Enzyme design. Structure first.
Site, PDB file in Angstrom:
ATOM      1  N   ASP A  29      24.966  41.153  47.780  1.00 44.76           N
ATOM      2  CA  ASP A  29      26.063  41.469  48.687  1.00 44.76           C
ATOM      3  C   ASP A  29      25.540  42.413  49.769  1.00 44.76           C
ATOM      4  O   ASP A  29      24.738  43.303  49.478  1.00 44.76           O
ATOM      5  CB  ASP A  29      27.215  42.069  47.904  1.00 44.76           C
ATOM      6  N   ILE A  30      25.964  42.186  51.011  1.00 43.74           N
ATOM      7  CA  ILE A  30      25.558  43.050  52.121  1.00 43.74           C
ATOM      8  C   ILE A  30      26.258  44.408  52.097  1.00 43.74           C
ATOM      9  O   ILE A  30      25.761  45.371  52.694  1.00 43.74           O
ATOM     10  CB  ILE A  30      25.765  42.352  53.468  1.00 43.74           C
ATOM     11  N   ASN A  85      38.235  36.979  43.948  1.00 41.37           N
ATOM     12  CA  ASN A  85      39.373  37.406  44.741  1.00 41.37           C
ATOM     13  C   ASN A  85      40.017  36.184  45.384  1.00 41.37           C
ATOM     14  O   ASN A  85      39.350  35.307  45.947  1.00 41.37           O
ATOM     15  CB  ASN A  85      38.944  38.416  45.813  1.00 41.37           C
ATOM     16  N   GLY A  91      42.296  40.590  47.944  1.00 40.01           N
ATOM     17  CA  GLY A  91      41.265  41.161  48.811  1.00 40.01           C
ATOM     18  C   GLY A  91      40.110  40.203  49.091  1.00 40.01           C
ATOM     19  O   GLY A  91      38.963  40.629  49.213  1.00 40.01           O
ATOM     20  N   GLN A  92      40.417  38.912  49.188  1.00 39.42           N
ATOM     21  CA  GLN A  92      39.405  37.903  49.432  1.00 39.42           C
ATOM     22  C   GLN A  92      38.913  38.048  50.874  1.00 39.42           C
ATOM     23  O   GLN A  92      39.691  37.911  51.801  1.00 39.42           O
ATOM     24  CB  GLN A  92      39.956  36.499  49.211  1.00 39.42           C
ATOM     25  N   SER A  93      37.644  38.381  51.044  1.00 37.28           N
ATOM     26  CA  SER A  93      37.133  38.773  52.349  1.00 37.28           C
ATOM     27  C   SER A  93      36.587  37.584  53.144  1.00 37.28           C
ATOM     28  O   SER A  93      36.390  37.727  54.331  1.00 37.28           O
ATOM     29  CB  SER A  93      36.108  39.840  52.199  1.00 37.28           C
ATOM     30  N   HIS A  98      33.700  32.733  45.996  1.00 38.37           N
ATOM     31  CA  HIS A  98      32.538  33.540  45.633  1.00 38.37           C
ATOM     32  C   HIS A  98      32.853  34.343  44.379  1.00 38.37           C
ATOM     33  O   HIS A  98      33.962  34.902  44.221  1.00 38.37           O
ATOM     34  CB  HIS A  98      32.033  34.434  46.782  1.00 38.37           C
ATOM     35  N   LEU A  99      31.871  34.326  43.477  1.00 39.96           N
ATOM     36  CA  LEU A  99      31.910  35.140  42.272  1.00 39.96           C
ATOM     37  C   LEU A  99      31.102  36.405  42.534  1.00 39.96           C
ATOM     38  O   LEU A  99      29.877  36.331  42.655  1.00 39.96           O
ATOM     39  CB  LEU A  99      31.280  34.387  41.096  1.00 39.96           C
ATOM     40  N   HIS A 100      31.766  37.562  42.507  1.00 37.90           N
ATOM     41  CA  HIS A 100      31.074  38.837  42.500  1.00 37.90           C
ATOM     42  C   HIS A 100      30.545  39.157  41.109  1.00 37.90           C
ATOM     43  O   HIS A 100      31.232  38.935  40.103  1.00 37.90           O
ATOM     44  CB  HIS A 100      32.017  39.971  42.888  1.00 37.90           C
TER      45      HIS A 100
END
Ligand code: A1IQU
Lengths: 112, 115
Positions: A29-30, A85, A91-93, A98-100
């Protein structure tokens, strides 16, 4: 409906790639929220988990198996948290599923 | 006693009561007893897998099914504005029960970081 994750899959912008196969990509993640914080994404453009199809089940499971394998390889032996998310409350950005995976620190409760 | 003897195994076998949302041959969705959001439920496999770190490769479709059932349940509960799915692994992850479980939280704005 392209996203920055589409550009990452197409190798058009830099990302620190951890793992790749024919159907998913894992990368750091950035904007990391833990000492280890990476994403596992499908190469198929599923915009959000709410619109995933039944025939996406295996693929979605694959994200989790890859995530757990990456965590082990990254030395996350005291544990971790996986997060998906959805939508504004979630809070889906980025409107690419995507799986964090976060670890290397104590994760707290509640999870946001 | 299939399902194991964690509290979740007992719920699967209807030995301990729970507020069940959905059930099929592979999984069970039920409300969490200590909710952290206005809606907070769990999706668990009926197969006892203790934690995601020990899931087998051929558990892929099952793990996927938890998320599909989670998303369907969220829709059926009217979580139109979204939600957060969480899997906790081990101590650092805050895993409370050693039977794999997908948390689904919604009905409020979820914050970042996710703990
Ligand atoms: O010790 C714990 N957390 O830190 C703990 C974890 C799970 C339960 C638990 N969770 C439930 C979730 C949903 C429905 C019923 C539940 N339940 C019944 C009895 C314990 C328990 C209780 C304590």
């Amino acid at each position: 409906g392209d996203t920055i994750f589409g550009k990452i899959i197409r190798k058009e912008i830099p990302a620190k790639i951890i793992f790749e196969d024919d159907r998913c990509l894992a990368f750091h993640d950035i904007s990391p929220q833990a000492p280890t914080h990476f994403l596992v994404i499908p190469k198929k453009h599923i915009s959000q988990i709410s619109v995933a199809e039944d025939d996406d089940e295996s693929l979605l499971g694959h994200l989790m198996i890859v995530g757990k394998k990456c965590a082990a390889d990254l030395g996350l032996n005291k544990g971790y948290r996986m997060v998906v998310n959805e939508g504004s409350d979630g809070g889906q950005s980025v409107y690419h599923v995507h799986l964090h995976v976060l670890g290397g620190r104590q994760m707290h409760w509640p999870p946001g």
